[PDB]
């Protein structure tokens, strides 16, 4: 687990803005913890501050800081941002973030745009962060207070809880603006995530209806509680595809519903056959299109 | 409206327990107000106390009192209280009914079930009439204090505040009470309610599909944020007929979808022209009938 | 007092619509308990029925109420009306008066008018019944219950308690309501008290000035935080004047300020004594004369 | 039930004050209605509004009102006053009192005193009564509304839930009262209660004890947490006893002691059984008795 | 910006404790951050930590700490402590200060003084700083956590709730207190907040009033709305000085309201003329004179 | 006050699991504040940073951290722990503790444990610490920010304010847990805190009643008051003490009760006498013996 990352970042994270190369590397407070100061190019970038974990109890988390000034618009915003972020994901449940030298996030997080939905707490919600707080202390008081801290859900329920709670903070976010150039730019954010999640499930509904089409078609000895079922999931599957098509604002509300009868037309309609295999298959790959609505 | 009725209650009501018949009449304390006994077959029944309203800002009333005690077990549960309270159903949105001799009634409203959903104020509720409010001042204090009192919703924006109020009062007692006879005639009374609900569905939605249809067809100068409300108002209002039409279980879910975003084209198609008054209207009407669900 | 009454009632009161006269008279419930049945002209008129008394817990109240509708657009809003409640308002503190056939005061209230703003509640407030409340119980349950009731102040204490409420009550419904006409109508009520209000505050600074002056030369064993509390109120109150003399513009609000260090000279000069009896009451009468504006 | 009150009431109540008689009976509102007329003396006195009960649901009650003004001094804080309500507690279980014409117990009520600590309110506490309301409903708008209205508890666990909250309404009274006079009556009208429960607890205690005693000895199949539970219930409901006794003064916090643990000890030996019916009955007895200290 | 600072420290701050001087410098952790190490005549002093901004979303701010205990009762306290801040506020906004060496105003805050009204809070409240915040986070937890922060108000309004705050919370202490000798001494720190603030407005009202007297007296054609305008201002004036001329505690009441009329009257009667030049401008500066008080 | 410290951890403090020692100095912070580096026989162990005060207005504290991941299922949990508790306690009434190397401890917390019943908080409750605070800010945020804080009760009252606070927490705790092994393990911790205080008060009641009893026995001249105050105080005592043989739950509630009439008794019973010299006497130290239940 150690390993993975130092050698990642010796031989190299590439990106269009240079090149990213550990400089120097140090041990942190705790065995399992560690500094690696990271360089662009040439050029000093930043630090990370790593614990690797200890299991069960202590999760790993990284903290970004300490980013050249002299970089800032050059780093902030860019393909090298993303792809080092990218790269965390894959061994990070948790994030912090310094965000001095970032203008754009800082002056959007000052006129009250919810964490996720700002420039740089985006590029984390695209990546899985779902969970975030905004920091803010003075560093007159103690320094290194102003970061974004970010995790991932650790359930299916959290994780639509934190949606759920993004959706109400950015509703609420809208109504309180009066900003036309931030508010398209917090609503294109916003889109983005609605819209990755409704071409899914204009597909996924696609074959979910297809695979309980083709179950009460042909399948024998089924129930009627059964025809029931994949007649009736189908029909919304149907309706939630509708919407989604027009692309209609309240298509979610029909996925989401499309959703539980998928669900209950998966859970019942399963069993051996190749029919029931691939419906209630369908189905769930239909219940799952649904879930990052929402 | 008076000469309705005292012809109607000079000519009878027939019923499988006798004829209704006014026995005397008097004026009341008011000008349109007015009091009417009435006896069952050879025997006194009860009063009616009647006020036949000052248009516009005082509603016609009854009460219902006085019920005679030897016909206690007689009347309350009957084709004479049906006929009763489907005939005054008719000329009152307003009706007070005393329930000191109403045992079930009493039993059910002293243990907790919603008035609209007791014996007796479950015969008001088929009626139309949709908010409840059960009285019981002592005797002691002031005369007259039992009754349950039974309104016909103002609007279609309250005839469905009244049901979705009914049916969180529902669940609660059904959640906190522990006799299960009890609970199965509540549940039985409420059942029957959103079975009849639900082919007041099957047309209001109709009258309110043709009516979205006729509304973003013709209408042209009207948002395009509204015809898109207008349009999938339609469309969820379309499906759902299909689950009912099949009587099906996975129904009353939909209908609860599709009444949220018939409320949204409700609220969002407002104006004075024609088009979008019987277009929210029709989906106003829909939703009313879909609360109970 | 009942004579006081017996002989005003069979004497009459003249007005541009006929004499008022006692018809019949009637023993209560109580034993200074009594119904006065007048008739207007030629027609019987309305109830009064009146309690003396019994002092000291028991105040005297009237209650006007059982209009002859045939005289129902003839009596409200009239000299009659005026005349009867300007003689009640000599013997009664407390009032109430159904107010069922009286549409305007019925609108008002149904359209949510303070009561003391209502065309009718206003009758009162005229002559100095500053606390209002609006019965409007259903009649199926209780006979009798659609009253305003209005009350004279107990204390000078109280009389600016009623009307400082009764400000507050005016601006939300002034804010909340969407009737250009009905607003203007009660902001006419309202701003035809506040211009009474001011003539009021003339001779109360007056008689309140002479007490403050009065206060802080004589007496002399006072603290010294109390005459720079009776200085400052006296010249606050001195100012204050001297805009309404001019009927100036900018006067409400320095009453607004006078008023404020006008009760902190009351409530710190308190005592047995007679200079300080007359100080605060000065005072006092002065801030209640104040709080509508 | 009737026939041993019409027998009662026409034989008389004696009273240092006079006979009490009925004068005059009639059928009242409903079936088991009635008022009765008395007399005292030569003189006509009050009546009784009476309501015999349909059981179970409703509950017998009384009303005391319409007394004769001539003779409100004699009445009220007299033999007559206690032989009345001495008789009326032995067959209602509710009373109501106009107590318009009792100035103690209005000025009583007037200045904040708890209805049950109210001259008349006190009266019905000392038979059994320990629920109170003070009604007071202006006149002007509804007829016979300044009533206290009294019930006898409907369980041990009603009767101590009375009471506890009595105290509480007693101390907030004491403490915002600045009249001694009245606090002194006030709290020597509480006194006695605590004193007469004091008694109430030594035999209450006592049928508990032998109840507790009686529940660890035989009953075999009971938890062993329960038989702790009973079992230091019994010693606490021991040691109080003791305090007693001797009238100690250390007494009244440890019957608060030991009530806790005597309610925790009803709480937890639940049952079906003769035996824990009676043993959770009786420690239920118990801390009824000892609310008020 | 950055040079005014280090230039003044480099000749040195007087004061009669010692000179106040730079002993040495370091960068501070952001490219805009500076430690300064200073010395009081030649025995070291305290550390300044100073960040300078970055225009436009981060202000300027300074930390106070790292005060010698050997010094902490010569220092604090003294002329010396008032040059100091005196110099400070003249470049920055913001600014922590430690208070472990300082008995008095620790002794106080430990007792619920408001903190604008200590004796540490106090030398910044006259230096403009409206908005304070009481830090006290344990040593254990975490050091350089027992600090003063405060800073300017950034509008009028603001610093009106502040010192509505402040006016608030300190009658909120009268009331609490029961040390006969901390009341004295924090109310005499209001007066002289308030009484500052009286006196000005008692001569910027004399001569409002004669700007308002001199104008409806011979200015020929103006309105009644307007010598009514001045006419009543002038009168307002007049009662305000009269509560504050006798000092009165109900002064400030009367100078809010006498505020309002003179701005009323300054706005509407200003135009060319040399009588509404300085009326309206007497009445402005007569506005201005009663901000300070409430 | 300093040197009781720096010589007890050179002479050394011996434990089963090594003999604790002192590696490295150095000073803190502040002029009373310090590092302390701790082995544990050679091996690294621990630091403590201590701050020893300055009267009146700040008092010591000592934080422990950095312990070593290599000895913490060692460390913890052992009687090298203890003893080093132990002698802090004897010179700190504050302390803070890391808990990142604390397994059982973490673990605990982290299921919501109240702080003073965890392995670790009870270590400390034990020797009479009695408010506490369970820090666990980010370590990406601010490191060193998980962290037990645990303080001394400064009066009789905030000590029964916190017992009473601990046994709200502890109910309530009960209430919400459903893990066997855990909830055994934390009422094992309340009980014998309740366990010890009901011994003692077993026996204070017995000798207290023997006050009491010879008391009111053969004194010659006492009032009623006075033999009804033994009296009954006796008897009080009787009853407690039944409970507490037969060691029920209930007996705190009568010996809570008894100390109040012992309280009586012994206040008012009291002079000159032998006797009432021992009466009082017995009964408060029967008083006394109640006070930790609650």
């Given at each position: 687990?150690?390993?993975?990352?130092?050698?990642?970042?010796?031989?190299?994270?590439?990106?269009?803005?240079?090149?990213?190369?550990?400089?120097?590397?140090?041990?942190?407070?705790?065995?399992?913890?560690?500094?690696?100061?990271?360089s662009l190019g040439s050029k000093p970038?930043?630090?990370?501050?790593?614990?690797?974990?200890?299991?069960?109890?202590?999760?790993?988390?990284?903290?970004?800081?300490?980013?050249?000034?002299?970089?800032?618009?050059?780093?902030?915003?860019?393909?090298?941002?993303?792809?080092?972020?990218?790269?965390?994901?894959?061994?990070?449940?948790?994030?912090?973030?310094?965000?001095?030298?970032?203008?754009?996030?800082?002056?959007?997080?000052?006129?009250?745009?919810?964490?996720?939905?700002?420039?740089?707490?985006?590029?984390?919600?695209?990546?899985?962060?779902?969970?975030?707080?905004?920091?803010?202390?003075?560093?007159?008081?103690?320094?290194?207070?102003?970061?974004?801290?970010?995790?991932?859900?650790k359930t299916a329920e959290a994780k639509?809880?934190?949606?759920?709670?993004?959706?109400?903070?950015?509703?609420?976010?809208?109504?309180?603006?009066?900003?036309?150039?931030?508010?398209?730019?917090?609503?294109?954010?916003?889109?983005?995530?609605?819209?990755?999640?409704?071409?899914?499930?204009?597909?996924?509904?696609?074959?979910?209806?297809?695979?309980?089409?083709?179950?009460?078609?042909?399948?024998?000895?089924?129930?009627?509680?059964?025809?029931?079922?994949?007649?009736?999931?189908?029909?919304?599957?149907?309706?939630?595809?509708?919407?989604?098509?027009?692309?209609?604002?309240?298509?979610?509300?029909?996925?989401?519903?499309?959703?539980?009868?998928?669900?209950?037309?998966?859970?019942?309609?399963?069993?051996?056959?190749?029919?029931?295999?691939?419906?209630?298959?369908?189905?769930?790959?239909?219940?799952?299109?649904?879930?990052?609505?929402?």
């Amino acid at each position: 687990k150690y390993e993975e990352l130092l050698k990642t970042l010796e031989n190299g994270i590439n990106s269009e803005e240079g090149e990213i190369r550990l400089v120097r590397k140090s041990q942190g407070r705790f065995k399992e913890e560690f500094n690696f100061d990271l360089s662009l190019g040439s050029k000093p970038l930043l630090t990370l501050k790593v614990f690797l974990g200890r299991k069960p109890y202590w999760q790993p988390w990284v903290e970004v800081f300490g980013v050249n000034p002299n970089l800032r618009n050059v780093f902030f915003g860019s393909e090298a941002e993303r792809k080092l972020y990218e790269f965390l994901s894959e061994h990070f449940g948790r994030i912090f973030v310094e965000y001095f030298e970032d203008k754009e996030t800082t002056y959007e997080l000052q006129k009250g745009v919810p964490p996720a939905l700002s420039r740089l707490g985006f590029e984390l919600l695209k990546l899985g962060y779902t969970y975030f707080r905004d920091w803010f202390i003075p560093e007159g008081l103690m320094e290194g207070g102003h970061k974004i801290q970010a995790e991932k859900p650790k359930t299916a329920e959290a994780k639509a809880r934190h949606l759920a709670n993004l959706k109400k903070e950015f509703e609420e976010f809208i109504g309180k603006c009066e900003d036309e150039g931030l508010i398209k730019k917090v609503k294109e954010r916003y889109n983005f995530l609605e819209e990755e999640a409704e071409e899914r499930c204009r597909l996924a509904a696609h074959h979910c209806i297809h695979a309980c089409e083709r179950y009460l078609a042909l399948c024998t000895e089924s129930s009627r509680e059964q025809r029931q079922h994949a007649g009736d999931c189908a029909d919304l599957c149907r309706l939630a595809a509708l919407l989604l098509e027009r692309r209609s604002p309240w298509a979610p509300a029909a996925c989401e519903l499309a959703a539980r009868y998928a669900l209950a037309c998966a859970e019942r309609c399963d069993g051996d056959e190749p029919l029931e295999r691939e419906c209630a298959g369908a189905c769930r790959r239909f219940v799952a299109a649904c879930a990052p609505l929402l």
